[PDB]
Write a protein that binds this ligand. Sequence first.
Ligand code: CLA
Ligand code: CLA
Ligand code: CLA
Ligand code: CLA
Ligand code: CLA
Lengths: 29, 160, 73, 80, 141, 73, 73, 742
Amino acid sequence: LPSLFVPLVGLLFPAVAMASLFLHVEKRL
Amino acid sequence: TYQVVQPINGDPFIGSLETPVTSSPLVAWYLSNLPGYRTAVNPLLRGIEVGLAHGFFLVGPFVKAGPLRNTEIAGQAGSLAAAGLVVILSICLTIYGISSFNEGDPSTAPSLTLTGRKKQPDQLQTADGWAKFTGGFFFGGISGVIWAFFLLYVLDLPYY
Amino acid sequence: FMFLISWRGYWQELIETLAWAHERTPLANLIRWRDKPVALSIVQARLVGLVHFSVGYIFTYAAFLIASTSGKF
Amino acid sequence: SHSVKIYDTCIGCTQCVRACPTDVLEMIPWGGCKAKQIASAPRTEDCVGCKRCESACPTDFLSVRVYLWHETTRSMGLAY
Amino acid sequence: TPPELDPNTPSPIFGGSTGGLLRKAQVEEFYVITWESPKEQIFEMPTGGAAIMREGPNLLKLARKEQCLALGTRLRSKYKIKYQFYRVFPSGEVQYLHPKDGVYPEKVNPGRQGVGVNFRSIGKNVSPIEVKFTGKQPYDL
Amino acid sequence: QAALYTHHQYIAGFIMTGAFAHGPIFFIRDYNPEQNADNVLARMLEHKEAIISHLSWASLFLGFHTLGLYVHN
Amino acid sequence: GDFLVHHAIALGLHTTTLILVKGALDARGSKLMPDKKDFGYSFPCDGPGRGGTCDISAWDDFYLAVFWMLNTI
Amino acid sequence: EVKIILDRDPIKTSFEQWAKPGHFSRTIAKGPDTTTWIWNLHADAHDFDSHTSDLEEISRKVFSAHFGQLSIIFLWLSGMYFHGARFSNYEAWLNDPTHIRPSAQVVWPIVGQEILNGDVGGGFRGIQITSGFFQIWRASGITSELQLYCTAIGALVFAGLMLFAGWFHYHKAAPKLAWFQDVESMLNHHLAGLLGLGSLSWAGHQVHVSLPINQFLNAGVDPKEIPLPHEFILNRDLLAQLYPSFAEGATPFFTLNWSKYADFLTFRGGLDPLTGGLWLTDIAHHHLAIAILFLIAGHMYRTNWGIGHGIKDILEAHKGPFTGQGHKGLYEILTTSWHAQLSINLAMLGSLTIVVAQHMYSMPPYPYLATDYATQLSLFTHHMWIGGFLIVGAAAHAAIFMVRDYDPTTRYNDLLDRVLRHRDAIISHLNWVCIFLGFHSFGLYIHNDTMSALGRPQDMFSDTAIQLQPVFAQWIQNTHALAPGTTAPGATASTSLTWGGGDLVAVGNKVALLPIPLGTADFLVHHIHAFTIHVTVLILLKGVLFARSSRLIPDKANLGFRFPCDGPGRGGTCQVSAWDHVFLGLFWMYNSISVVIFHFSWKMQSDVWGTINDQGVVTHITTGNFAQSSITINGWLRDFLWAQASQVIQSYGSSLSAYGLFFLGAHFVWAFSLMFLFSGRGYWQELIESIVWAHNKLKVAPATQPRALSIVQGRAVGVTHYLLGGIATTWAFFLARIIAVG
Ligand code: CLA
Ligand code: CLA
Ligand code: CLA
Ligand code: CLA
Ligand code: CLA
């Protein structure tokens, strides 16, 4: 049942994305 | 002539005030003994305690108010969710630390004691310590969930 | 309507009382913010307000347009 | 910080300097008007941008202008 | 002329307020305003409610400066007083801010040199396009 | 049929306001007064009060009577 | 019935245009703010002096016009 | 010191100042240069302490102003009584109150309005009133239109006396500042003189006119046959046949040994099964206790005989470890600042109006008031708004005091101090409670909506699923049920029928009152009330506490009480002023009161009001759907708004079409407010520039230079129309619904 791509888009991608953005945003070169 | 309410540490030009809920001997004793405030202890060590307590506690709300039980045999599985939330949280902590503290940097806590005893360097609050704290928070978080769940299997408690 | 009717000075003064709270709360002031919390700017408010007003506008009528039609066809 | 300029249209009334809440402007000798003085913005780093200065200028068009620029802690009026 | 220096002078009688200094004072900056009082008097605190001036030299630490001028301005009128305020920083260096040039800013002083004044006054500034791509800005000219 | 019509009329509407947004932006960022001296574009600004007041009259005329007739009925 | 709604439509068009072109033609300045250029397309205002100048920027009448365009469509 | 009457001789009386607009202000008496002048003239008209700084003059202005107010109220009462005499069917209604609709306004036959003169019964054409005056008049024993006509003249005469007094006490004999300040005196009189004698006086008319006449009306005798009230005073025989205790004179009262007066005075409690109103025998008795109580209370404060209390003494002696020397200096503040007094009085008078509404619906005082749902819904809703507004006004003047009269160097308080010295702790906490209440009241609804829409009714917060039974209110409810005989042996029946349990009262075919059920639906709405109220409190208290200073604006007090802002600096400082907090609080009061009166309207129709036949079968108006459908926002949209709004949108051609017109009419001005609330005067002033150009072109530009509304006025105009529009909509909606269905 491919409909299990939903969580990946639904949650995993968002979590990774958020974490990454958060890090990039708080970075101090 | 005796007022109970006083400026903080005797300094009226600084933020806070002194009240029975802030500087009572009972409140002071209690807060100084939480795992968080044991400045002199391993951060990792301090964390695990927080995880264990918090983990254990989280199982209750998930299981009892969960869609899966509510008369539905799923039951104690909820606890599993709780095991999922301590993962989310761990992630956040790891993030907070990574972003906050840098590797080379030193502690950012405050070295002066309330009484001015300059004598005290302190804490985690460093890239190294925080990682330890979260790392321990996790281990404790998972273990907390498991033991509550473990009790759930054995049963006997009045609520569930 | 909140962003469009209430303006900034009110929220700025509210947040700075919350800035006080966080620093004076035990166990919570172990965690410090890296970005200073402030009220949304004057223009930003009108943008955020308008977006809500517009999103609501479009989503409300669309819910009505489709349902009333497709319910009857 | 914000940008604040003055123009030879200034008449030396000195009102803005009196109006400013953060001591940004001051008066300096000049010879372009009967008052023989003109405003100056030597400390634009402390300005907040409330425009109380502008609100107090009687020139036809403001002789003191405040161009809101990059935001700093000082300009954002933060006590924290 | 050199500014005054301080500091070991006492501070006014107050009971404590929530409007007081915060972490910003510890890690960014904080300000001090100082004055001489003829009598022991009562005044309204910008941050808090009510405080008592102490006769003789007085020292007050406030966050933000504007608080310093607001109180100081009140000190000048209301009661007649002479005041000064400095910027503390956290290292320990201090910086004299106001008055900063002998006299107050309202009064013209010869020592002062102009900053940010355009001799072509008016709104004779050029259109934005003219400076387009030139880091400049029309007013800066 | 209902969906598609409503879809495009809102798209068209949003697009129309944007068209009248970059028009202003042009006047501020790119418009060169000397290089457009006395041409049709410049004359617009030259009699801008006349343009605006009549648009105001047309809006007031339509508004007063369309509402007026609706309320009467 | 078709007659009346069309005038409503006419009302909607004229007002939204009135807002937008008043915004465009006043982007570079007015009597209240002769130098509205130098400040750009989008700025919060010009303070409470000279009577008060909220929503005086060309960005802000766009902001106003969207409401009317939403009403029109 | 010794308290006495102090006045001064004539202080001018001429039309000279009528001819000079804005004379009261030195800035505005010079005339207009712009159109702003005109608005300022009306906005500073009543700002007396802004006119002069002398406290004596301000006090004299507000004293005559109160006479002016009373004059209007007396003129207003004169009309209601007059209209009940010339243009009403009160005499018709007096025979058949249960079927005939009360009406007291006839419309002229011009342009087609005569349609509004509908079938109100009694062979009469007019507009149904919901003021409630018919039930007051019947309760006072008013029989004929002659008596209403005499009261009309009496009120009008009083209106003249009030108006004359105001002139006399400002232009002829003006009270001195020392006279106004005698607060120990004034409280003694208002406690004993106004309230004590006032309640005593009405207890008399009741036990001589109301109680005798009402008994005749209930016996079923024709109103025209009933002897006039004065036939009861003269011939005691009539008032002896009924209520035989009158056989004796002052005895037993004079000989004590109370009482054989239990005959016309009792602690019966409950509700009259024939009139649906509170027992008149209880109400008369009630006013007897109130009189004496206030007469006793009127002798606490010391005046000119050394016996009593100095209020200044009482306050100073109330100081604790936690509070300092607090309460000291409050007497000098409250005797020196009008705004300080007005804030307390508004807060309390406003709070009183709110408890009045909740008390008049659950304990119907006037005969045939309960089953007239049209009036009860109107009375409750009316007082809720009046009380609601007055409370917001308390915040305004509390703020004004902080800005204008607050001086630590002259009139320190210590209690007011400390509060300012931790104002961030109070506001930050009140901030938190609101967020907690928002989530835990409204969030529960959104939860319910989502679960229902997903087809999971068992995952909702409801009586049939996850229950939130309000047990604390239920336990109390049960306690008042078991109150008579057990707790209060003197009480025969319950306090209210909402606590009855197994008791019901009906008049005609309609239900007067019955035990009101409480469930999860009632739990959710009450926390919504707890939520909305706090947020209103937050906005207003924040405005008062931070009125003078702030970390953002150290010298906000210098900018005044009513200013637009302090510029776009510091990120922007719009609506920092205390005025703008009152302005913001106004919307939230509206938000709170609106969900309160919706809570009332639905609960009453669904669970209380309805038809009852002689088999016991009760059929409620909306049929008890409150429990299962008020727990969802879609339910409120559908089963409440959509369903019940059908009467007002189907009222064209009917007698209720004016409500149909006001329904749309109010939607209009509400949306109209949004133009002012979402925009700024910068745009409008520039638009006016192009329009001013056109007039100059045709040589028709006015000297009074047109200007856009001030920043503050734009907010004043906006919130005013937002309130007028929103409230008037619900008004038209309520009245059409309850008149048609009820
Ligand atoms: C597309 C995005 C998305 C997806 C896939 C889900 C999926 C789910 N939601 Mg969530 N939710 C979302 C968005 C989403 N939600 C948003 C936007 C909101 C805010 C309105 C919520 C608010 C919400 C609430 C309040 C609840 C849910 C619940 C649920 C679960 C209900 C089904 C169930 O009972 O089975 C099984 C039930 C279980 C408890 C199985 C547990 C699942 C295991 C523990 C996963 C392990 C943890 C995971 C690996 C950690 C995440 C790592 C990742 C971030 C990298 C299901 C897993 C319910 C729930 O989870 O029950 C407590 C529930 O209470 N959702
Ligand atoms: C009848 C003769 C008379 C004359 C010639 C005056 C003349 C004067 N009065 Mg006096 N006054 C009078 C009667 C009179 N008054 C009465 C009967 C009262 C008792 C209420 C007062 C109470 C009074 C006070 C408290 C004050 C004066 C003041 C003044 C001076 C200011 C002039 C002015 O603008 O007034 C105003 C002209 C008006 C037309 C105002 C009309 C206000 C009425 C009451 C409104 C009625 C409410 C209305 C129905 C609301 C519905 C509105 C709706 C329909 C839209 C002026 C010398 C003022 C003063 O001394 O100057 C500093 C002052 O403070 N008067
Ligand atoms: C339903 C609410 C509402 C209404 C009625 C209006 C009405 C109007 N708008 Mg506004 N607008 C609104 C909402 C509304 N707007 C909102 C939410 C926004 C976003 C902020 C705007 C933003 C906006 C902008 C930027 C502009 C307008 C303009 C206008 C005017 C357009 C010309 C016109 O119709 O002439 C007819 C007039 C009317 C339809 C209103 C008159 C009302 C009655 C019929 C007058 C008669 C009164 C009657 C005697 C009763 C008196 C009562 C008594 C107490 C005195 C008109 C007054 C434009 C303008 O100023 O035109 C030149 C303008 O540029 N609007
Ligand atoms: C005991 C009652 C009471 C009294 C005596 C006062 C007295 C005062 N107030 Mg307060 N106020 C009150 C209650 C009261 N207020 C309440 C309940 C609120 C909450 C809304 C307020 C909120 C408030 C604010 C925000 C302010 C005041 C201010 C003032 C001062 C000047 C106001 C003025 O000039 O009048 C002028 C009167 C008008 C301009 C009339 C305007 C008409 C209104 C807005 C709409 C009426 C519509 C009507 C109800 C129905 C529509 C009919 C229409 C179609 C014709 C004056 C001391 C001002 C001040 O600065 O204090 C020193 C000030 O800014 N008040
Ligand atoms: C319907 C529109 C609306 C909404 C939702 C709000 C909401 C709120 N207002 Mg505003 N307000 C409004 C209109 C609105 N207001 C308007 C038109 C005005 C102009 C007068 C104001 C003026 C105003 C003032 C002056 C204040 C507020 C305050 C508040 C907050 C009160 C505290 C609270 O309840 O926390 C709870 C939050 C909610 C109940 C919002 C709903 C939350 C949902 C149901 C749950 C979360 C969804 C989901 C789980 C999130 C994840 C989704 C993910 C995909 C991102 C709250 C956020 C006060 C404040 O700041 O708080 C202390 C404050 O002082 N309002």
